[PDB]
């Protein structure tokens, strides 16, 4: 079938995006650089094909261009900062840190816009490829919650600019998805899969308790981010 191949090209595009974005726009790498600056003493593989409509292709291209542009500015400013720090130029180093704070948020937003574009498309493709799967509803629910968790972590990961209000909106979205998932009817002959689905739900509630606490501090913490990224990496995996 033509639609099945198109649906698998949407999934593969998402996987490639997730791999590239995890390598070039990783919050831990960006926040480590910002941390250093505070111390007082080829991407043509992502060209989207016609399995996406023209608006979607243009949105992806513009957001990836923006992402790489703000990433280059960020690391250029960091290398300029290292030269200025040696030159004892306190005025210029402060300006570059101020610029790199704004650029780190822009980089995070571009990454979020790319995931926002792909999320309903990957969802539609998965619904087609899993049409004959007895646990379609369970798989779909976990995939969507994993995406919502990843969006919350992205919003939290913004060192010097933790976005509380957007975290809260995404937590309400996650709570709504969780209550719907808890109502998914069990399928006979899949008790092993059901136990691991129930463990997924329990891990989401744990994540939510940890994120409520982290978010209540009103600011990004390297300690909270490292703890939560380690605790939920494998359990709430967005692959």
TrEMBL record:
Domain named DUF3829: residues: 1-132, 134-236
Domain of life: Bacteria
Signal peptide: none
Residues forming coiled coils: none
Protein's name according to its UniProt entry: DUF3829 domain-containing protein
Organism: Bacteroides thetaiotaomicron (strain ATCC 29148 / DSM 2079 / JCM 5827 / CCUG 10774 / NCTC 10582 / VPI-5482 / E50)
């Amino acid at each position: 079938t033509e639609e099945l191949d198109d649906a698998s090209k949407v999934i593969n595009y998402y996987h490639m995006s997730l791999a590239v974005l995890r390598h070039v726009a990783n919050a831990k790498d960006i926040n480590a650089v910002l941390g250093y600056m505070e111390q007082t003493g080829t991407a043509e593989l992502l060209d989207p094909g016609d399995y996406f409509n023209p608006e979607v292709r243009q949105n992806l291209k513009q957001n990836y261009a923006g992402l790489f542009n703000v990433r280059t500015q960020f690391y250029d400013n960091f290398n300029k900062f290292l030269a200025y720090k040696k030159s004892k130029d306190t005025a210029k180093t402060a300006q570059l840190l101020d610029e790199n704070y704004k650029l780190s948020v822009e980089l995070s937003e571009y990454k979020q816009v790319i995931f926002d574009i792909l999320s309903p498309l990957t969802e539609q493709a998965e619904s087609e490829l899993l049409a004959d799967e007895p646990l379609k509803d369970q798989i779909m629910a976990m995939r969507k919650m994993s995406g919502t968790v990843q969006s919350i972590m992205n919003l939290y990961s913004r060192k010097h600019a933790m976005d509380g209000v957007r975290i809260d909106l995404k937590m309400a979205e996650l709570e709504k998805e969780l209550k719907a998932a808890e109502k998914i009817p069990a399928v006979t002959g899949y008790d092993e899969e059901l136990k691991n689905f129930q463990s997924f739900l329990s891990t989401v509630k744990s994540f939510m308790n940890d994120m409520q606490k982290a978010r209540s501090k009103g600011a990004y913490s390297d300690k909270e981010y490292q703890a939560m990224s380690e605790a939920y990496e494998y359990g709430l995996s967005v692959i």
